[PDB]
């Protein structure tokens, strides 16, 4: 079951760290294929494939962020024989955070780093009536990813197969409620787009309130999907953070 959830596009047997990579609500494991190539051999990428995406399109979407986290903790166990860092974008950032919080009590060594991309701090909310994604937002964000994910849009048969799950997960993201007063103990490095309407700089810096460790905010040029255009400076930052304590 572990490799149905986790895709290893580039084996790196001598890697000093594994990086669990969690996509946004629309995204699939394949989004992270170039990162896997980029980070190996020093870091081994484990790209997460949520139920309902790509090859898992026939599976029902998860019941909640809580449930997804529960299921992912069990899946990550076999991979705990080396240090785990988490990278997540938007929805993925939330799950990354919840994983990080739960890992030690679940019987995994504490994560070595949390990279939170394109997401306001877990304690930060907005009174904006956003309880899910509009169809126009959903499609816009798929197009932005390019690759196999954007390709679905010219494939209405396959799009029909994955839409229910993607919609459900966007609703999960807005139904999400953090546990107040919790902090991870690992370093948190925050990536955010300078003109992302969904994440303000204050909201991004507020991740410092969710760790007892160092918090490093990096604002990069771009919107909600800045990470596509800004992969190089991000990868430079990630490789350095993961090359030391
Ligand atoms: Cl999302």
φ/ψ region of 120 (left if φ > 0, alpha if ψ in -120 to 50, else beta) reads: beta
202: Cβ–Cβ under 8 A, 6 or more apart, which residues? none
Partners of 193 in the beta sheet? 220
Output the CA 26–ligand 1 centroid distance in Å: 7
Contact 4, 13 (CB under 8 A): no
Output the CA 92–ligand 1 centroid distance in Å: 7
Q: Three-state SS for 47?
A: strand
Task: Give the C-alpha separation, 2 to 70, whole Å.
Answer: 13
Output the CA 6–ligand 1 centroid distance in Å: 19
Q: In what order do the strands lie in the sheet with 43-48?
A: 6-7, 43-48, 17-22, 84-89, 113-117, 188-193, 215-220
**Distance spanning both ends of the chain, measured CA to CA:** 31
Task: Give the C-alpha separation, 171 to 168, whole Å.
Answer: 5
Contact 191, 234 (CB under 8 A): yes
What's the CA angle centered on 14, arms 9 and 18, to 5 degrees?
55
Task: Give the C-alpha separation, 91 to 174, whole Å.
Answer: 9
Show me where the chain is broken: residue before each gap, C-N > 2.5 A: none
> Which pair of structure tokens corresponds to residue 38?
């980029």
DSSP annotation of 94 reads: H
Partners of 191 in the beta sheet? 117, 218
Task: Give the C-alpha separation, 10 to 18, whole Å.
Answer: 11
What's the CA angle centered on 135, arms 69 and 138, to 5 degrees?
45
Resolution value (Å, 1 decimal) = 1.8
Question: Pick from 64, 37, 51: which is nearest to 1 by CA?
Answer: 51
- CATH number, span 1-245: 3.40.50.1820
> Which pair of structure tokens corresponds to residue 103?
């890992």
DSSP annotation of 109 reads: P
Task: Give the C-alpha separation, 167 to 160, whole Å.
Answer: 11
Output the CA 90–ligand 1 centroid distance in Å: 5
Is the omega angle on the peptide bond into residue 41 within 30 degrees of 0, that is, cis? Answer: yes
> Which pair of structure tokens corresponds to residue 241?
């953070």
Q: Three-state SS for 235?
A: helix
Sign for the CA dihedral angle at 195, 199, 201, 204 comes to negative
Output the CA 243–ligand 1 centroid distance in Å: 29
Output the CA 132–ligand 1 centroid distance in Å: 9
DSSP for 120-140, please give it.
--TT----S--SS--HHHHHH
Output the CA 168–ligand 1 centroid distance in Å: 11
Q: How many CB atoms lie within 10 A of CB 46?
A: 25
CB burial class (10 A; 0-12, 13-18, 19+) of residue 131?
A: exposed
Output the CA 14–ligand 1 centroid distance in Å: 32
DSSP for 50-87, please give it.
-TTSGGGTTSPPPS-HHHHHHHHHHHHGGGGGS-EEEE
Q: Which residues surround ligand 1, an ion (CB under 5 A)?
A: 24-25, 90-91
Contact 79, 9 (CB under 8 A): no
Output the CA 120–ligand 1 centroid distance in Å: 11
Contact 119, 94 (CB under 8 A): yes
> Which pair of structure tokens corresponds to residue 10?
């580039």
Q: How many CB atoms lie within 10 A of CB 21?
A: 27
Helices (H) and strands (E) in the chain, counts: 10, 7
Output the CA 244–ligand 1 centroid distance in Å: 30
Pairing of β 188-193 and β 17-22: unpaired
Question: Pick from 76, 24, 28: which is nearest to 55 by CA?
Answer: 28
Method of elucidation: X-ray
């Amino acid at each position: 079951e572990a490799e149905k959830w986790l895709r290893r596009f580039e084996r790196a047997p001598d890697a000093r760290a594994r990086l669990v990579c969690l996509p946004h609500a629309g995204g699939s494991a394949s989004f992270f294929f170039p990162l896997a190539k980029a980070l190996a051999p020093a870091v081994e990428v484990l790209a997460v494939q949520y139920p309902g995406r790509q090859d898992r399109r026939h599976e029902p979407p998860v019941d909640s962020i809580g449930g997804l986290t529960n299921r992912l903790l069990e899946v990550l166990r076999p991979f705990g024989d080396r240090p785990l860092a988490l990278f997540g974008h938007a929805m993925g950032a939330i799950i990354g955070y919840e994983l990080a919080l739960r890992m030690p009590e679940a019987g995994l060594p504490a994560p070595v780093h949390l990279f939170a991309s394109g997401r306001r701090a877990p304690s930060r909310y907005r009174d904006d009536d956003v309880r899910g994604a509009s169809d126009e937002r959903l499609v816009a964000e798929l197009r932005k990813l390019g690759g196999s994910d954007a390709a679905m849009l010219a494939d209405p048969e396959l799009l029909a197969m994955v839409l229910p799950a993607i919609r459900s997960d966007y609703r999960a993201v807005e139904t999400y409620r953090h546990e107040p007063g919790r902090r991870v103990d690992c370093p948190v490095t925050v990536f955010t787009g300078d003109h992302d309407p969904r994440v303000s700089v204050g909201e991004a810096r507020a991740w410092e309130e969710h760790t007892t460790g160092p918090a490093d905010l990096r604002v990069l040029p771009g919107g909600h999907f800045f990470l596509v255009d800004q992969a190089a400076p991000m990868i430079a930052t990630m490789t350095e953070k993961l090359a030391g304590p």
